[PDB]
Amino acid sequence: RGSRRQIQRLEQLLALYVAEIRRLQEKELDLSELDDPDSAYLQEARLKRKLIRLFGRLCELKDCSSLTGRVIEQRIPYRGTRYPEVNRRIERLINKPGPDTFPDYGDVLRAVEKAAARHSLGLPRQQLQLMAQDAFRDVGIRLQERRHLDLIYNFGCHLTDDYRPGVDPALSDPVLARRLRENRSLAMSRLDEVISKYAMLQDKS
């Protein structure tokens, strides 16, 4: 157990960092400020890093883990094949900690072949390939879902915490809604256009 007095001091400091982050979040940056390495956005980012380091040290002091309760922390189970060796290996593959855990098909197939060879399951190559494709598909869905949820449950700040979609001004203002509709048609075209641009470039090369 950590020193009570020191925990208290560090927690007061933590609250102070939070107050300053909220202050910086509400700063209005003009165009020249957006060109500035010392802008409030960068000040705020650095303060967030400072804060996360202090949180880590407080976790040291209370002998707790570093877990914050993120959605991406929650384990995704996979029972998908008829061979539990393969299933375990796939659960392993998809449950690595961190924002970067997203296997490609090769990773999945390697896990399948590895569990096969390791446990001498005698599975031939096309059965292996089919198992890997089915598995990859399954885990793809689950990983994308976990990230989406991690995003939408963790988004924004106190300024957006009262957002609800029924309050969209556009719902009560047909002129505004019309302009937004026009914008949306433009947005979709622009995105298609940039995608096509780089495809065309790939071809012409």
């Binding site: 988004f155 995105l191 470039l201």
Partner: protein, 83 residues
């Protein structure tokens, strides 16, 4: 024949890392330029809507709330947020 484009902007390492975060281990040369382009277009789309909201409020400052309202109109990325 081969040539290096100049860039003041998003460097290759971050792009390779976003790709990797998507599960894509290896990307072509054109993917860097494409990623910069697509990023610019997405940001334009969002900001166009956000500024429509800002002007409707008669402000000069784009708020986070303007950005949320705009983002919800960009499709799947923020879908479900706030309810």
């Amino acid at each position: 024949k081969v040539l290096r484009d100049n860039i003041q902007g998003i460097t290759k390492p971050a792009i390779r890392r976003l790709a990797r975060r998507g599960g894509v281990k290896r990307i072509s040369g054109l993917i860097y330029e494409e990623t910069r382009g697509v990023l610019k277009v997405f940001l334009e789309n969002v900001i166009r809507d956000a500024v429509t909201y800002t002007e409707h409020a008669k402000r000069k400052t784009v708020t986070a709330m303007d950005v949320v309202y705009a983002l919800k109109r960009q499709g799947r990325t923020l879908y479900g947020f706030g309810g």
